[PDB]
Amino acid sequence: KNIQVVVRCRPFNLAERKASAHSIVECDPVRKEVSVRTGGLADKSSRKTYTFDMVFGASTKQIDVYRSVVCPILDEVIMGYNCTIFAYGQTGTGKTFTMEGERSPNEEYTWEEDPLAGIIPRTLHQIFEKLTDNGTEFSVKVSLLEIYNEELFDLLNPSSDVSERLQMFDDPRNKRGVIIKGLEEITVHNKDEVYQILEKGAAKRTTAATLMNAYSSRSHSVFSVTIHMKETTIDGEELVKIGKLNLVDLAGSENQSLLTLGRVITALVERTPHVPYRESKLTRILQDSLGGRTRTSIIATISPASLNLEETLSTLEYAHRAKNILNKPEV
Amino acid sequence: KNIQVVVRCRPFNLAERKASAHSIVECDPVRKEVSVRTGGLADKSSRKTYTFDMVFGASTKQIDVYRSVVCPILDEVIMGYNCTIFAYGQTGTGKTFTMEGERSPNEEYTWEEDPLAGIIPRTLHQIFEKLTDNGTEFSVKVSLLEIYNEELFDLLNPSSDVSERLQMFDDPRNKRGVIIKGLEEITVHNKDEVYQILEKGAAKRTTAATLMNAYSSRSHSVFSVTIHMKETTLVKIGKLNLVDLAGSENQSLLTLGRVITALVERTPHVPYRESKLTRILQDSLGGRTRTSIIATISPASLNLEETLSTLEYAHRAKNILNKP
Amino acid sequence: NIQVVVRCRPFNLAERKASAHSIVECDPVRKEVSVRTGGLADKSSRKTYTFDMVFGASTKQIDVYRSVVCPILDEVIMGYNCTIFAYGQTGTGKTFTMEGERSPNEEYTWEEDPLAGIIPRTLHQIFEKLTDNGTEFSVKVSLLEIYNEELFDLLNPSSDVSERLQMFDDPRNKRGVIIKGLEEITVHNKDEVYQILEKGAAKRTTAATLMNAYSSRSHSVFSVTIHMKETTIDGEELVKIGKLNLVDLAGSENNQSLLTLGRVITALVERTPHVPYRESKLTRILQDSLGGRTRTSIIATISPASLNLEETLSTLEYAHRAKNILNKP
Numbered sequence: 013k014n015i016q017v018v019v020r021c022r023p024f025n026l027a028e029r030k031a032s033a034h035s036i037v038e039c040d041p042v043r044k045e046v047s048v049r050t051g052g053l054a055d056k057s058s059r060k061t062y063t064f065d066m067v068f069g070a071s072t073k074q075i076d077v078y079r080s081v082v083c084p085i086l087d088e089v090i091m092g093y094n095c096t097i098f099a100y101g102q103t104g105t106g107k108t109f110t111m112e113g114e115r116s117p118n119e120e121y122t123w124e125e126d127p128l129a130g131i132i133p134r135t136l137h138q139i140f141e142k143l144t145d146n147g148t149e150f151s152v153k154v155s156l157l158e159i160y161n162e163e164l165f166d167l168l169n170p171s172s173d174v175s176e177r178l179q180m181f182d183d184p185r186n187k188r189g190v191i192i193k194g195l196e197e198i199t200v201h202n203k204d205e206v207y208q209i210l211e212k213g214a215a216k217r218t219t220a221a222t223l224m225n226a227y228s229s230r231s232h233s234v235f236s237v238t239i240h241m242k243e244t245t246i247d248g249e250e251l252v253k254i255g256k257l258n259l260v261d262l263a264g265s266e267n268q269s270l271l272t273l274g275r276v277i278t279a280l281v282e283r284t285p286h287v288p289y290r291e292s293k294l295t296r297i298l299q300d301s302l303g304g305r306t307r308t309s310i311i312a313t314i315s316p317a318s319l320n321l322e323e324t325l326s327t328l329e330y331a332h333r334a335k336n337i338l339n340k341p342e343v
Numbered sequence: 344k345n346i347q348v349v350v351r352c353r354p355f356n357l358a359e360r361k362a363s364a365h366s367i368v369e370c371d372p373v374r375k376e377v378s379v380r381t382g383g384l385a386d387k388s389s390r391k392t393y394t395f396d397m398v399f400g401a402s403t404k405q406i407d408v409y410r411s412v413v414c415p416i417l418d419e420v421i422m423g424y425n426c427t428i429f430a431y432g433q434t435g436t437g438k439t440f441t442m443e444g445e446r447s448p449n450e451e452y453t454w455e456e457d458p459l460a461g462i463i464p465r466t467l468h469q470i471f472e473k474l475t476d477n478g479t480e481f482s483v484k485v486s487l488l489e490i491y492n493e494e495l496f497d498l499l500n501p502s503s504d505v506s507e508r509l510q511m512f513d514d515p516r517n518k519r520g521v522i523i524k525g526l527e528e529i530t531v532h533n534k535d536e537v538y539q540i541l542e543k544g545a546a547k548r549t550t551a552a553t554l555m556n557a558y559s560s561r562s563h564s565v566f567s568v569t570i571h572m573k574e575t576t577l578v579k580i581g582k583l584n585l586v587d588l589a590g591s592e593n594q595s596l597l598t599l600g601r602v603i604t605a606l607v608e609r610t611p612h613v614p615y616r617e618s619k620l621t622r623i624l625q626d627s628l629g630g631r632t633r634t635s636i637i638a639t640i641s642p643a644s645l646n647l648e649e650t651l652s653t654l655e656y657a658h659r660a661k662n663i664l665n666k667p
Numbered sequence: 668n669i670q671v672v673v674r675c676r677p678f679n680l681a682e683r684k685a686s687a688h689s690i691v692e693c694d695p696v697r698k699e700v701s702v703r704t705g706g707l708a709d710k711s712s713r714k715t716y717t718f719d720m721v722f723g724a725s726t727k728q729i730d731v732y733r734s735v736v737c738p739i740l741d742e743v744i745m746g747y748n749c750t751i752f753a754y755g756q757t758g759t760g761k762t763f764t765m766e767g768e769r770s771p772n773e774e775y776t777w778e779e780d781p782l783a784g785i786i787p788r789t790l791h792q793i794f795e796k797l798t799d800n801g802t803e804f805s806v807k808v809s810l811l812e813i814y815n816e817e818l819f820d821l822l823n824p825s826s827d828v829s830e831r832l833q834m835f836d837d838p839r840n841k842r843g844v845i846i847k848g849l850e851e852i853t854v855h856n857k858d859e860v861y862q863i864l865e866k867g868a869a870k871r872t873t874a875a876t877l878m879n880a881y882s883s884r885s886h887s888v889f890s891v892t893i894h895m896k897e898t899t900i901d902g903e904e905l906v907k908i909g910k911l912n913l914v915d916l917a918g919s920e921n922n923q924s925l926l927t928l929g930r931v932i933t934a935l936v937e938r939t940p941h942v943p944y945r946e947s948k949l950t951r952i953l954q955d956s957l958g959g960r961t962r963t964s965i966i967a968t969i970s971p972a973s974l975n976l977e978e979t980l981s982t983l984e985y986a987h988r989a990k991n992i993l994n995k996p
């Protein structure tokens with residue numbers, strides 16, 4: 013089962029518009045193609061075109077990404093599978109906008125109806141809508157860690173100092189798994205507890221950014237939600253499903269974890285014997301998502317601007333080749 | 344004939360004066376010498392002294408540079424020769440001031456009379472003065488591209504996005520020439536069309552500085568004027584490249600140094616092809632083009648090592664033969 | 668042998684803003700520094716170091732002076748060459764320790780100012796100890812800085828702080844060098860001290876304006892030389908000369924003089940035959956006063972904050988490698 017790769021192009025921002033930026037990206041959602049204009053002033057006709065599993069153009073809204081991509085993934089998680097979605101792309105292209113979102117100003121929407129909310133809050137909101145009172149006895153727990161300079165910080169930890177570090181070990185019970193020693197896993201009892209948790213998480217990250225150089229662009233963010241489901245069959249049997257969803261917002265593609273991820277992906281695509289998972293914190297964490305039994309999706313984010321031609325091409329090639337990686341989703 | 348090399352030292356700026364900066368540079372126009380005080384507090388007798396084709400001290404005004412250096416060169420160009428002037432030196436020493444200049448404030452002067460105007464505007468002006476007054480039919484075309492990170496941008500292009508990139512290909516009908524694919528070459532019908540053209544180019548550069556890290560200090564700027572003169576007994580074509588190099592303090596600058604060394608040592612394979620700048624400049628160097636270098640320096644003690652680096656770098660270039 | 672002490676500064680505003688946790692516990696009595704090393708993963712992990720002395724966040728400037736400098740100033744007065752270094756990451760209190768700071772307004776005189784560091788106190792005390800002692804004596808000072816292996820003279824009459832010194836072997840002293848161009852100012856009485864220091868600090872301020880990350884990369888070498896005369900019953904003279912070098916090193920975080928100094932301390936300490944003095948401007952300058960004949964002290968400054976774990980451990984390992992003291996029980 014191949015890793016699914018989608019592309020999301022953001023709209024122009026104000027600074028690009030003030031610089032009279034030209035578009036070099038055309039997205040065709042129906043053909044699922046992205047075509048980029050590569051020849052600038054010299055060669056008006058040259059393009060590079062790629063087919064992906066889905067393509068989202070500049071007008072795609074947060075809700076569109078959720079309906080197209082996330083909903084199907086979540087339903088699989090609820091069936092008791094493990095799934096991973098990660099965002100890959102240049103700093104400034106919308107990785108964080110996509111994975112987390114933002115709050116619209118003034119207080120003019122609830123967090124659950126905010127059009128700027130991204131994948132994490134919609135996912136948590138939906139977990140509760142989908143399972144609450146639908147018979148399922150169920151629990152939800154969340155964690156949020158960040159990797160920076162191969163050190164591990166805990167955004168949800170009750171410790172008031174964000175710099176207190178985690179430690180990673182192999183998990184003796186799960187052959188591709190790790191244990192994040194010290195990681196705070198918060199039980200979310202109902203959706204009315206969701207916002208405050210995320211909010212405190214974001215406030216610790218804000219502090220971290222004042223502490224460490226180029227923090228948000230160099231950091232990888234790893235959000236995980238685990239759903240324990242217990243049901244009761246008409247026969248009398250008690251049956252337990254456990255689903256886990258990893259939501260990952262990588263460092264800007266433009267560095268050991270980012271570097272090792274590339275080497276890991278390259279080794280998977282070229283079927284080379286040794287896959288260097290152990291050489292970074294990120295790839296140890298993602299081992300099961302990258303040639304394990306976790307179902308993995310990639311969202312490659314790009315800018316439409318001519319200025320960014322080179323990184324836009326690099327992102328598309330990187331993402332396109334990852335469509336060849338096969339996982340064995342199973343639970 | 345040898346590549347001509349001159350030196351221009353700028354006056355102290357206000358931050359230097361506030362830092363109580365001492366001069367370590369003495370320029371002697373008559374001996375054509377630059378003498379640098381090198382011993383600091385330790386040895387008051389140490390100097391490095393260099394002889395150049397011309398030396399311009401702190402008090403030199405834009406018009407002196409134009410009259411002394413460019414007038415003779417522009418004569419050559421009008422006679423159908425190709426010429427190239429490039430400024431080399433540390434960021435902050437006056438490479439752009441010299442090649443382009445600046446606008447005095449409050450519209451005090453027309454652009455033709457502005458004391459701060461540099462080589463490019465004075466040249467375009469004088470081309471029209473000299474030839475209009477000549478009688479012969481002539482046309483004038485200009486282009487302005489910049490090299491940043493080995494990418495080529497067109498400052499005069501009608502395209503509204505300065506980031507749209509040019510490409511470079513070998514010129515099939517010239518062994519040392521290149522064609523800049525996409526390059527806007529604007530016909531200048533009258534000197535009253537000059538300022539707006541340069542003005543828009545500069546506005547596009549301003550946008551570019553905004554988009555790319557340390558743009559103006561790392562960019563090389565290539566301004567070219569071409570004059571077609573209909574003579575009988577004929578078309579005479581004169582081309583003048585006016586080049587404002589990246590700060591000397593990076594593939595193109597790197598390769599230029601290697602090219603210059605290879606030309607100095609008289610080695611076989613000058614690596615012109617290993618950077619955009621040297622491919623563009625190939626024909627200039629060890630081509631028929633007559634080349635002048637204007638080496639720019641600061642007078643301040645603080646900048647000692649870079650000042651010596653510039654002087655040494657430029658001085659050796661005097662031994663290179665043009666061949667035009 | 669080398670004396671090694673550790674000084675931990677107090678939390679600063681930004682660290683409190685960011686709710687910083689301490690990972691450093693200092694015990695002056697036991698001369699121990701205990702570092703909390705396990706963050707979130709292991710609450711019980713601790714690394715413990717033992718030094719000649721340990722000063723905690725509350726330690727006053729004058730106490731650092733009394734306990735560290737005085738014994739050393741006595742040796743100098745007896746005509747020997749001594750050096751005191753401050754070592755540690757930028758921001759931990761090296762310059763605070765070596766020079767101190769000037770309390771706002773003028774609530775105290777420089778001699779009384781509780782923020783004054785080792786340099787001003789040392790000068791003040793030299794005159795006290797010798798001015799009521801008897802003896803005829805002479806005091807001169809120099810303050811130079813090493814930046815990118817370039818040498819700048821902070822007390823020089825030259826108005827341009829960028830005029831560079833040069834360094835040569837002292838033909839009459841194989842372990843010494845001549846700092847060509849160096850301004851040695853005679854300080855006649857204590858009422859001349861402050862303006863000299865103040866002119867030097869003003870030169871440095873200008874330098875930091877000229878050169879990238881100047882104060883964090885520079886080594887600062889302040890030198891006091893004392894000439895002391897005594898006549899014999901027959902009118903012959905015997906001068907004894909003492910020298911004190913107060914050295915505020917470049918930040919240890921993550922240049923050439925810095926690594927060389929390390930190799931020289933390492934070589935002096937594990938006692939290797941050839942000491943690498945020649946290799947840097949800093950160790951050539953200080954060779955005279957190093958070797959073990961004379962008292963040498965390193966004040967390793969650290970931060971208490973969790974954020975700085977790795978650099979604090981690194982500073983501590985450095986200090987520990989300079990004089991290995993074993994933990995007690």
Ligand SMILES: Nc1ncnc2c1ncn2[C@@H]1O[C@H](COP(=O)(O)OP(=O)(O)O)[C@@H](O)[C@H]1O
Pocket residue numbers: 021022023025072101102103104105106107108109110114313
């Ligand atoms: N799809 C989008 N629609 C509108 N604005 C976007 C979109 N994606 C990103 N942005 C905006 O672009 C800027 C950078 O996005 P961000 O999420 O920080 O990117 P990254 O995480 O890749 O650095 C932010 O101001 C964000 O609001």
Ligand SMILES: Nc1ncnc2c1ncn2[C@@H]1O[C@H](COP(=O)(O)OP(=O)(O)O)[C@@H](O)[C@H]1O
Pocket residue numbers: 352353354356403432433434435436437438439440441445639
């Ligand atoms: N010959 C000169 N006379 C007066 N001012 C000058 C001179 N050369 C340079 N300057 C000033 O010095 C500063 C830096 O000049 P600039 O041309 O930007 O140097 P560079 O292009 O070599 O970085 C500018 O403010 C400019 O006005």
Ligand SMILES: Nc1ncnc2c1ncn2[C@@H]1O[C@H](COP(=O)(O)OP(=O)(O)O)[C@@H](O)[C@H]1O
Pocket residue numbers: 675676677679724755756757758759760761762763764768968
């Ligand atoms: N022991 C201390 N007590 C109070 N403040 C201190 C102490 N040590 C350092 N500081 C403060 O920390 C900051 C940095 O100290 P500084 O001497 O500049 O460190 P360094 O020279 O090692 O970079 C200054 O604001 C200083 O006042």
Ligand SMILES: CC[C@@H](C)C(SC[C@H](N)C(=O)O)(c1ccccc1)c1ccccc1
Pocket residue numbers: 108109111112113114115123124126128129130132133207210211213214
């Ligand atoms: C205050 C808005 C927070 C709570 C945010 S966006 C955080 C932003 N991307 C940042 O980097 O600070 C969120 C949560 C729900 C709805 C909208 C936004 C959020 C979403 C996921 C995880 C943490 C915060």
Ligand SMILES: CC[C@@H](C)C(SC[C@H](N)C(=O)O)(c1ccccc1)c1ccccc1
Pocket residue numbers: 439440442443444445446454455457459460461463464538541542544545
């Ligand atoms: C507004 C003054 C422009 C038109 C300038 S100076 C541009 C400046 N060095 C910059 O980097 O922006 C000029 C043109 C004529 C007379 C004086 C200045 C000019 C000179 C040569 C090429 C382009 C601009």
Ligand SMILES: CC[C@@H](C)C(SC[C@H](N)C(=O)O)(c1ccccc1)c1ccccc1
Pocket residue numbers: 762763765766767768769777778780782783784786787861864865867868
């Ligand atoms: C105005 C206070 C000066 C004179 C200072 S502290 C300089 C400060 N550390 C800096 O880096 O600028 C000093 C001198 C005496 C008493 C208190 C401070 C001093 C101490 C030693 C050497 C030079 C200055």
Ligand SMILES: [Mg+2]
Pocket residue numbers: 107108109228229
């Ligand atoms: Mg981001």
Ligand SMILES: [Mg+2]
Pocket residue numbers: 438439440559
């Ligand atoms: Mg310039």
Ligand SMILES: [Mg+2]
Pocket residue numbers: 761762763882883
């Ligand atoms: Mg300091």
